[model samples]
Target: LNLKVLHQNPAVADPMGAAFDYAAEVATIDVDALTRDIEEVMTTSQPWWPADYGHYGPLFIRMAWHAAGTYRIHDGRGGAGGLDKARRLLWPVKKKYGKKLSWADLIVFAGNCALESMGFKTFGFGFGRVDQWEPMAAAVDIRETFRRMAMNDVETAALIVGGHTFDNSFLEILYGYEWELTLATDLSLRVDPIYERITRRWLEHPEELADEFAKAWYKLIHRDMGPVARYLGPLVPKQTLLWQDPVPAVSHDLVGEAEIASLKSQIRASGLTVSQLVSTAWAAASSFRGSDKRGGANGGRIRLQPQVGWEVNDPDGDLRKVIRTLEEIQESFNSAAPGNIKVSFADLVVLGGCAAIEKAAKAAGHNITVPFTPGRTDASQEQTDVESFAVLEPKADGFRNYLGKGNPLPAEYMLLDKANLLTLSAPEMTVLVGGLRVLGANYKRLPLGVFTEASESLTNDFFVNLLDMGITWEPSPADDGTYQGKDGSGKVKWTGSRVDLVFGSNSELRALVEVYGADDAQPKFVQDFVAAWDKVMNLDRFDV
Candidate 1:
């Protein structure tokens, strides 16, 4: 079952890290403000808001989600590492998804943000990826951010949107049709009045109550909360009905760890009618709902959808409604109370949470190593002899290439600076270490969106310094129609140079100025733009 926890940033709440902090430091750098800039597009321009403009709800989250998918993972050897934009321009079908994104990265990263904020454990992530200069679908620019990636899978689409909204269900209402089914079913079931007139606005699901309850339970007995308090407020009674297990899948570590202890009672499927529940609560909270609206708002008795009308007499429904109401009251109490003052029973619950965080932080410290430990035998922080830190002798994993071109040799790696390997242009150098190949290195250099302007400049400096250094750098064929799309180019067109360090130039220093910066990234990207002119006129090794 898909579950979501939505928490937001004090600034922009987008999942992409760059999209946030990058905005605050814009004056020191050259890039535009992320949140402010996006807002301008929304407020001033005709294309940023409304059903027709841009994806309305949470725009920042949308952008963050878009940026994350660039990293792709694999099983054999991990690859498609996406920390920065890789060939972000015109990617996944040219400008179609160029500035856009892949859904996978966005959602998972956002999930991390939400859980972490809630002080929950974060699931680690890793990816398969390639950037295309062509649009994956006809809709590159669209009214809604959610439908941008047109992959033919519902799960993929759903997940992408989930990230775009920080996995928050309420925020999802902004997207009309896409979420119609889920919204309708859940809403209809809850407010149907066939269940119960939920008394307060708070998480109603009991299974969800674990986080809240642990805190309250501790609050009543003791003055403070503990690590277990973190488990309390998320739910009450812990909706055992939803799943067979004590903890649901939404929470990984927190729920998983304590579920065995909470499983003292079995959660069973609940048989409750919405109306009866509502009526029973009304009888206590309000004298009205005790009367069925089945007579119709028109006051004319009318037939309605089966089982949806006048189920007030269902005793089963009545019991469920009372249970639901009580749950609502608990939820309301906890939610309304301030975290600081524990005046009410609910306030006491939050007080427990405060204690829990304090407890948790300490627990986190014990398990987490901070200093070095020396020992005769091995232990976690156990230190080896300082001199031992240096490996006097290194093991040979395989034969070394004679040219010493493989790693440690600082052999230059190359790709175009523009859309990366495609569109023959400025070449950029990325530390394409031998023995360790980073997937999509060429493409990543293209998206300068994430790093600070200073960071990018430093990147350029790295490229420039390496260019000045005696290194082998290769890029696109010089741009005089000699190197736009010379075929066999996706991002990196592998040549026979892999066996050694020398990657012949398909690139140039001039292109660096053209594509990247003040002849900046040339070395890092297209070093040795000048090619060697020796073809071995009196060559040897040409024997039959």
Candidate 2:
């Protein structure tokens, strides 16, 4: 591995790529797989065949032959994202100056590592630069080219000036890539499922996502005069730009950071050092205040707390009296939590609904408690006594608003009407993601909001909500024999409600159903129930 060989020899040239016509297969980026391959090539292997040119001499020529021979740009979506750039950087094989590279320039530079790992010269590996896309933008006339266009940096940057150059893992962490870009706590029900799908679809949507990324990047870099000049000015010579196309990272990282900071303050908070959080959890779990039955024979008690332990009631309140009070509290709780607003735009709907429940409970002079099992100790469940078994409701507040509204519950459902307009202020993308999480849907994404729970009820709700809110879905025929219902986004007409209103004593919950379904048909059971319910619940309506 001699530096003299490279200095004496020259680099090769690269050609442009062609537009592919992939009858509709999508773009793909197995980044992990791709990274693995890059790592392997850099570490263990060398070019299988060798063809001559310059420093790339034999390897470059061979790569061109089999690789170059097999390429056809006409309909090459699967060809390669960066196939055609093989030749152009031959001389500049970038960063091969004096420094060594594992696979640096693969042959000469990487030849260093290729030589070293085998105990040859310990040539250090230098950085390698490559192109973004394969089939380059259609090369044009020289007369159409300007001084900047003719210049290596400007013209090439203009052709595909994605963030001023070719694609790389650069700043992926800073820009929500490479790194996890995680949310500190579990989002709402179905929110995780739905969001997981969205991100899964997003990150792996192949070139579609890349296109979106490119467009977003364009808008961003094209916005600020500073970013525009530094990144795009060299590329766009005559085009005008504007800032109204707001961007987060390029336009303002401060905004995203500030927003992230604000988000950490929400239902899911984030600032706990491991110990501090453990201490807090311990504190909460230990907060049970109860009488210590300290008499040795009688045995004393220390109430356990928070995530576990049991409850106790007021010694002063009679059981029957407390039952009536508790029943009333339950009714009030259910009433205040009537609508499952999981799809609502904001958790405020949930919080506000919960407040009403708490207020009603306070008015009843009672508190819901998880009572203990007898003979239990703070340390083990073996002696633990179990108490309260009431399952008043499961996250009723979140799903309440949506349910009562009589709409099909979707993961992204929101009461977008004027009454719920204030909730619109919640971050939209974040809201959609939240809605998906609560729905507990399946997502092919990385870890964040996957809904692996049984039946994914919450996730289904979010999806129905997304549809309810007019989210576009490209109807695809199900391989299971279900035909594609709608053609595309606009043609998507949805169906009846997915949430069932299971009630007791009477069917007061069927009011909206009766109304909306009047155009369809009424059941005999409903007719009888309505006659009786109307006669009672509406006592003042003695119009008979």
Candidate 3:
């Protein structure tokens, strides 16, 4: 089952002491002094990995790029987790810096220092990359590898030429040489339409190529480090790039409890169904990835391109319609509120989910409040990088029981990976999935996992019905990736997919399922689900 990915979770595998704070230790570093030390190491020749042309700058740059280049934007894994030989080479500097410098930060910073040593000015450097405890093909493979790293045609061209050196010599030589030793992938730049367009432009304008290379190289290393807020030290750029998924600073006063209640009431009366409100809010908030801390509901990018058009987000127009209605509510509330008190569509989208949950709980014989925190601001289409944001799209979301076509892994494994990305524990994943199923939050409203008769109310029915000993599950006669639960009379009682059944099939997950499935566990189940729901909504709220 290739369960190795599960152990990569730092909380589960890290050997570091609980009291050690890497961020606080990193803050004590003298970055400039460290950079100078790295430069000294770069220029000085060593017998281990001898310097090329009396300078190790190019080697360090390549090492750093390989260290960071493994990062794929899809799941936000890879990046400078660990590099044995590279780390060994930097051991002298690492020992000198002691606890203040992390190998993760030092490796990238060394590359930056290498560039500056060669007289190539970098855009900026940020020092928040922390160390983790654990650590693809050819022309079609070449494009796929770079694409996985979230590089476009222009960025890829810039990286190939810029990465070779700070100058445009790589491009110059590629177009200048017509030797027989060329690889098919190298020729790809000359033949591919987009790559050719970008490369030809760079050949004519070397200066522009230099500039693009600097920026693209910066992005390549820092892409996995997450939002600009997490970046540290003096050299961080004052300008925010669109790829960072920039959300505007909150200039106006945020809505108070009184405003929240008023907004919730208006949302309820907006003629939108509970399912619509809950599903839309979940769609917005669930994009969060704890790995890189990107793709959360804070920007309300769900209402914009890429996200709005994603198949899983109800692109058949339902989600867009919900966004339009929420936009209307946001406009009406913001216009009439006191000048200081303005509500954002981002906050409203989450609030609608909170409001829907409260109503659903009330209908299920419970009086409970779903926690709401409201400081998210909407990001305009101009502020968003559509191509970069597109990677955040869900191919298979286990909470929604969404398994898109062409999945390489089974539904159960994808569910675990999704939970890992969400920073969820087994219990949290189980509770949320059961809650989402009963709340009718499945993607495309598929009945695969909705085992409850009352699909609109928040209850323990999904778990209770799923664990019922009287039911026997068998593969559907239709041969789809779903199972039908048959009763003693051989009648189909309910149907579910692998994700739902895995909760019962897996011992650990089934243990949690059994707890929520108990006769008296209804209240506990509702409370846990609410907490898990709130945790997801606030996953991107770094400000708080």
140-185: candidate 1 lDDT, tens digit per residue = 2221232222122222323433333332343224332344434322
The alpha-carbon deviation from the true structure for residue 96 of candidate 1, after best TM-score superposition, in angstroms, is 27
Strongest candidate by TM-score: 3
Q: Which wins on TM-score, candidate 1 or candidate 3?
A: 3
- Backbone Cα, N, C clashes tallied per candidate: 59, 83, 1
Q: Candidate 1 or 2, higher TM-score?
A: 1
Q: Which stretches of candidate 2 lie over 4 Å from their true place?
A: 1-160, 163-355, 363-365, 368-398, 401-498, 502-544
In angstroms, give how far residue 404 of model 1 lies from its true place.
17
Query: Candidate 2, after superposition: displacement of residue 293 in Å?
Result: 47
> How much is the lDDT of residue 357 in candidate 2?
25
> What TM-score, computed on C-alpha atoms, does each candidate reach?
0.19, 0.16, 0.88
